[PDB]
Amino acid sequence: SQVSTRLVRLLNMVPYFQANPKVTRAEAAAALGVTGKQLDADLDQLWMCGLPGYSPGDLIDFDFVGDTIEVTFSAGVDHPLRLTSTEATGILVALRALVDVPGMVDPEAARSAIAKIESAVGSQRAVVEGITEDTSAEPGAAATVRTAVRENRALTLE
Amino acid sequence: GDFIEDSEAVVAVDAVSFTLLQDQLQSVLETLSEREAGVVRLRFGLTDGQPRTLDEIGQVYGVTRERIRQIESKTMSKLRHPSRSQVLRDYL
């Protein structure tokens, strides 16, 4: 439900703040896709909860420098929560659907992402799989189109 | 029964060390403001025998819990300065 998603986001905020030492308010809001007031309320709620015993040196403590967020005591929160079956399956399905679409994404990048996600989550051959291990059907026009899009250069198409 | 050591007896060295630690901690806390010193004493339970909770202190001082947490964080950051920790380094 909504409460479960809020709990997951609040629990995973700490590793995100640890990854970026001086992430600003705007970057955090864009990353989490939430309004400023909601992010402030979640930050306040996360600030006053931590280790049992409830000592100021035991619970989670921050360090506000102007409009920047930094973590000084993770209170044991060092890694983000694992990936559930549904979200991992959806991500794999989306990647394997978009790998076959020409020009939207590089096939090598999609294959690397699939391999890394499968290694991280420990999936096996009993999941969604593609048709061709190596396409090799691209004539190189898609790469040129993507390069022209990225660099904003003139392109000739027949 | 004459070769069994009583492990619950006072070592007669931790008592004097703890007394000196309390005196030194009071001396260090005397260098702060009244508000921060009172907040730290109430939160850590240095006052009489036991600690309190963040909401309780916020209600007693009539301020928001966010303000109490910010005050405690600032005080702890200040107390981590080497000047106020060099004296207490040898006690740990």
Give B-chain residues touching A63 at CB under 8 angstroms: 73, 77
> Are B66 and A44 in contact (CB < 8 Å)?
yes
Q: Which two tokens stand for residue A140?
A: 């190189």
Is A44 in the B-facing interface, judged by CB distances under 8 Å? yes
Q: What is the 3-state secondary structure (H, E, C) of A4-62?
A: HHHHHHHHHHHHHHHHCCCEEHHHHHHHHCCCHHHHHHHHHHHHCCECCCCCCCCECEE
Euclidean distance between CA atoms A122 and A119, whole angstroms: 5
- C-alpha R_g of chain B: 17
Give the minimum alpha-carbon distance from A44 to chain B in angstroms, rounded to a whole number.
Answer: 7
Secondary-structure breakdown of chain B: helix, strand, coil percentages, each rounded to the nearest 5? 65, 0, 35
**At CB < 8 A and 24+ separation, what contacts does A53-58 make?**
A54/B51, A54/B53, A54/B54, A55/B43, A55/B44, A55/B51, A56/B40, A56/B43, A56/B44, A56/B72, A56/B73, A56/B76, A57/B76
Query: Which residue reads 């009583």 in tokens?
Result: B6
The H or E element that residue A113 is part of is helix A107-121
Resolution in A: 4.0
Interface of B with A (CB under 8 A): 40, 43-44, 51, 53-54, 65-66, 69-70, 72-73, 76-77
Euclidean distance between CA atoms B40 and A130, whole angstroms: 61
- The amino acid that residue B69 corresponds to is R
**Residue of A56, A63, A72 with shortest CB distance to B72:** A56
Give A-chain residues touching B56 at CB under 8 angstroms: none
Give A-chain residues touching B44 at CB under 8 angstroms: 55-56
HSE value, Cβ hemisphere, 13 Å, CA-based, for A39: 18
Q: Which two tokens stand for residue B48?
A: 């009489």
Euclidean distance between CA atoms B54 and B56, whole angstroms: 5
Technique that determined the structure: cryo-EM
**Among all residues of chain B, which has the CA nearest to that of A52?**
B53
**At CB < 8 A and 24+ separation, what contacts does A87-94 make?**
A88/A117, A88/A121, A88/A123, A89/A127, A89/A128, A91/A117, A92/A117, A92/A118, A92/A123, A92/A127, A92/A128, A93/A128
Query: Which residue reads 């007896």 in tokens?
Result: B9
Q: Which two tokens stand for residue A37?
A: 């007031």
Task: Provide the angle, in degrees to the nearest 10, between the axes of the packed helices A36-47 and A2-19.
Answer: 80
The answer to whether the beta carbons of residues A71 and B91 sit under 8 Å apart is no
Q: Which two tokens stand for residue A7?
A: 């709990």
State phi, psi for A94 to the nearest 5 degrees: -65, -45
Give A-chain residues touching B65 at CB under 8 angstroms: 48
Look at the alpha carbons of B58, B64, B69, B71 in this order and tell me if their dihedral is positive or negative.
negative
- The amino acid that residue A76 corresponds to is G
By three-state DSSP, how is residue A72 classified? strand
> Are B73 and A63 in contact (CB < 8 Å)?
yes
The answer to whether the beta carbons of residues B70 and B78 sit under 8 Å apart is no
Query: Which residue reads 């492990």 in tokens?
Result: B7
Is A47 in the B-facing interface, judged by CB distances under 8 Å? yes
HSE value, Cβ hemisphere, 13 Å, CA-based, for B82: 0
